[PDB]
Each structure stands twice: as C-alpha cells, then as structure tokens.
Amino acid sequence: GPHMATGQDRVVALVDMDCFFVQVEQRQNPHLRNKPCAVVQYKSWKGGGIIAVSYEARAFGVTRSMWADDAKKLCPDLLLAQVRESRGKANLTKYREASVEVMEIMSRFAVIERASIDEAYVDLTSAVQERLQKLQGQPISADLLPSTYIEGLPQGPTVQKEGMRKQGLFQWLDSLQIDNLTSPDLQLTVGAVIVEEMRAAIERETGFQCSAGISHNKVLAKLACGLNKPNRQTLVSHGSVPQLFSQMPIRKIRSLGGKLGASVIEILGIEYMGELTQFTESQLQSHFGEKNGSWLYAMCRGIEHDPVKPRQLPKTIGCSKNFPGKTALATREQVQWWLLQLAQELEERLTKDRNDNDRVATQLVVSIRVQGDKRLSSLRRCCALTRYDAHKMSHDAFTVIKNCNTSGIQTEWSPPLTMLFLCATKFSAS
DNA sequence: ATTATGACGCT
DNA sequence: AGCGTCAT
Ligand SMILES: Nc1nc2c(ncn2[C@H]2C[C@H](O)[C@@H](COP(=O)(O)OP(=O)(O)OP(=O)(O)O)O2)c(=O)[nH]1
Ligand SMILES: [Mg+2]
Ligand SMILES: [Mg+2]
Numbered sequence A: 001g002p003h004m005a006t007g008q009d010r011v012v013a014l015v016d017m018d019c020f021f022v023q024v025e026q027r028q029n030p031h032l033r034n035k036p037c038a039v040v041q042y043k044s045w046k047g048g049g050i051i052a053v054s055y056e057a058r059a060f061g062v063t064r065s066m067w068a069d070d071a072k073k074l075c076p077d078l079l080l081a082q083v084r085e086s087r088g089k090a091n092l093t094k095y096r097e098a099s100v101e102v103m104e105i106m107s108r109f110a111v112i113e114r115a116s117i118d119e120a121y122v123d124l125t126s127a128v129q130e131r132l133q134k135l136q137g138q139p140i141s142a143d144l145l146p147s148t149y150i151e152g153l154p155q156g157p158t159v160q161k162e163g164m165r166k167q168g169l170f171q172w173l174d175s176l177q178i179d180n181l182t183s184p185d186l187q188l189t190v191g192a193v194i195v196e197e198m199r200a201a202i203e204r205e206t207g208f209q210c211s212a213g214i215s216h217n218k219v220l221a222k223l224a225c226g227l228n229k230p231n232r233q234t235l236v237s238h239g240s241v242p243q244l245f246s247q248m249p250i251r252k253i254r255s256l257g258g259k260l261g262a263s264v265i266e267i268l269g270i271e272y273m274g275e276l277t278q279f280t281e282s283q284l285q286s287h288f289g290e291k292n293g294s295w296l297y298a299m300c301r302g303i304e305h306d307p308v309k310p311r312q313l314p315k316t317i318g319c320s321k322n323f324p325g326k327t328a329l330a331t332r333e334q335v336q337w338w339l340l341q342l343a344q345e346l347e348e349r350l351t352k353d354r355n356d357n358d359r360v361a362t363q364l365v366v367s368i369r370v371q372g373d374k375r376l377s378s379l380r381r382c383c384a385l386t387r388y389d390a391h392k393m394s395h396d397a398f399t400v401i402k403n404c405n406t407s408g409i410q411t412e413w414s415p416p417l418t419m420l421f422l423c424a425t426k427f428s429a430s
Numbered sequence B: 001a002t003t004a005t006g007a008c009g010c011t
Numbered sequence C: 001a002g003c004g005t006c007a008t
Helices: A020-028 A068-074 A093-107 A125-135 A161-174 A184-206 A218-225 A238-246 A259-268 A273-278 A281-288 A290-299 A332-357 A390-404
Strands: A012-017 A037-041 A049-053 A079-082 A112-116 A119-123 A148-150 A210-215 A233-235 A317-322 A329-331 A359-370 A379-384 A412-429
Touching (some): A012 A184, A012 A218, A020 A037, A037 A068, A049 A068, A093 A112, A093 A119, A093 A184, A119 A218, A184 A238, A238 A273, A259 A273, A281 A290, A329 A332, A332 A359
Parallel strands (some): A148 A233, A210 A233
Antiparallel strands (some): A112 A119, A359 A379, A359 A412
C-alpha cells in the first residue's frame, strides 16, 4: 500500500531523430525532401544495403537491411543517397557530426545520455521542479503541447488523427491536479512541455525533426517514443502501463527482443509484458537470474531504476569492415593494407576527438572474423594504444592477430578474413 | 553478400 | 581480459 514503490520519482525523456541519416541527406540536398528516399552503403552488390528509410518510402514497404535493388521493386521512384566512401570503406563522419549538433542542443536543457548516434535520454526531474516553481500552480494549456499524444487517451463515453490526439490531450489536461507540485502526472506533463521546447529548438537550429517519449524511466520513455512516429511525442504515465502492457509483445521492450525475451516467452508460456505480473520476483529470478529477474519484476509494473548517465560522448571510437564471400582477405599484403586503411580512419577520428573533447584513448582492440565462423567476432585481442599513429596502430594490430594465420606460407592468409575491426577504448582526460 | 558501429553483461 | 548479447 503506502510503502509500495511506484517508480514515479523521475521524469525521463528519450529523444530519437526521425530516419536520421535520411534527414541528414535531405537537409544537404533539398531535391530529396518530402520524397520516398533511403540511405545506402555501397552500390555494386544488389544496389547497396539500405540503412535508413524516409517515412514516405516506408509506406511502400522499404525497410532497413533491404538491398536497394529490391527496394526499387517495391518503390521504383525511390531516391537513394550513398554513404561516403573513404580509404575503401564506408565513412559515417557526416552523420556523427550531425549527431553532435543535436546532442549539443539537447545538452542546453539537461544532462543527456547519448544512447546512439541519433538518440539521447534526458533526465528532466530537476528542470520540471524548476518550471513548476515558475508556473505557480498555473494550469498547462494544450497550446503548450501541440505535438503530444497521451497514451491510452481518449477513452470512454471525430474520424481524423489530429482530432483524436487533441481529444486525448484534453481529457488528460482536464484531469490534472495542477496545485500538487508532487503529482507525478503533472510532473510528466511539465516534462512534456519542456520536450516540446527541446524538439522545437532542435528543429529550428538543425532542420531535423525528431520524436520523443516522456515517462518515469528510460524503458518506458523509449517505448513511448516509438508509439507516434514521426515528428510527435508521447507521454506514457504510470497509470497507462497496465492497459499498454496488457497487449504489448515482450519483444518490444528494450533488452527483450533477443534470446532472453524468447526464453521468457517459452519458459513462462506467455506473450505479453503484462502477463509477467503474475510471477513472484523469486520465480523470475529463478528462471532468468537475479538481475534479470528483479528487473523484469519491476519492469512489468512500469518501474525501472536505470539512471540517465551523464555521458554525451561515445565511450569508444571504432572502424570496421566486412569482406564477404569472395572479397575475403587471403594474402598478408591484403590484411596489412586494410588494417592500414582502418587505422588511418581511426587516427583521423581520434585526433579530432582529442582536440574536441580533451581526452586520449589508451587501449586498441583488434577484432577479426575468419571465413566459416558463424560468430560476428572470431577473435578479440587488445594492445596498448600509446600514440595516434596509423602505421603504428596497424602494425600492432597485425602483431596481435598474425598467429591466427593457419597458412604454412608466410604470404598467404588462411582461413581468409571476412571482417577487420579496430576500436580505441579506455579514454583518459588530457 | 546485412553493414557499421556502439553499449553493456558474463566469467 | 576475451567473449556474448542486444541494438539497428
Ligand atoms: N551503418 C549502419 N547504420 C545504421 C544501421 N542501422 C541504423 N543505422 C543508422 C542510420 C539511422 O538513420 C540511424 C538511427 O537509427 P534508428 O533505429 O533511430 O532509425 P532512424 O532514425 O533511421 O528511423 P526512426 O524514425 O528512428 O525509426 O542509425 C546499420 O545497420 N548500419
Ligand atoms: Mg535511434
Ligand atoms: Mg530505426
């Protein structure tokens, strides 16, 4: 009863940029705006692999991981932008730099956790206390929430989507207790007002549109963000969780879309997140381990305690390239030339990072995949990263992998290499 | 021949 | 440390 934690202590937002790489290319090339378009890596094999898709193109069934030649069968007028190639490999610098633009804007409002190139969590708890102090119990106008959906509303006793959005928002605002500065629903609402402001700032200052979720923790904020894309934001209240989860496939919750989620389904004989509530915490721990079990017990009740980490910069800087089927590297000269290409991109990015961010990486991780191995990584070895020198890094990477060569000949490489990966890690301030 | 990352957990 | 999972 009165002691049962409800996980309503924080206001957390998740901001995800809509079809990010597409928007970066559409900003640069206005001929791509408001068109079905996609971003592709490479071109020779099946037209290149699609990694981002505009919402107009998604209406035709174009998806990520589709070959552009097949996408063109679904959408013959699909427009394509190609990722830049440098030193023989895909170079994502333009999108990393665009991401920095967005993350700096969001950092003006609150401390953010960079979760990916195009999404960040925001801890708005303190900003919400501030805005509530400034409001002085003044009600929140629907005008301040022009792109907000309230999940689960409207409910109870129009045939157009904006009309439904506004009915739901009206029902929500009508039920608000605006004189209770500690009401979680009011705090979420103020958080949504702030996120409207943040998203407006991102669009004004970059041209990019985004979606967002506002809830009491990261998992619900992420889930919420996905409910009304593109260019909209969604508030998921604590009270909305029983109905939301009652039909929510377990795999939709972040961390459960893989083997653990499949095992929850098969072991417990359930389909939906809400069905987890019928198990004790000890039962879930017995199947899925102490940490997963406690997390699932709380998560299916809408409660999650994982903090928004104050981290705007990536923890690692890496370069990787696959060498599929017959492009596999089978000679020493090959392996060395490509280690050097990867190392030269890494050196460029590391030098920029040291100048921008006052830090130096101290460990170089070298990962490879050999032909025939099913695992995405066949071997990981670390060595010291003591100088930002591409020839030195590529020589060191060769030194740490050179005994994987089964060939008795010194010039041949067997089994041939289908993937090279260099990653700089363990940053120290400088 | 799904590609290029990147975070985090396990032991 | 090296490997696995999950994300996309
Ligand atoms: N290189 C590479 N980049 C990827 C891959 N998957 C996604 N990305 C990039 C391109 C996307 O624009 C960007 C952000 O991914 P998201 O999952 O947020 O999707 P996106 O923003 O494209 O669309 P969304 O509106 O969020 O559904 O990450 C991939 O497999 N390889
Ligand atoms: Mg994202
Ligand atoms: Mg996506």
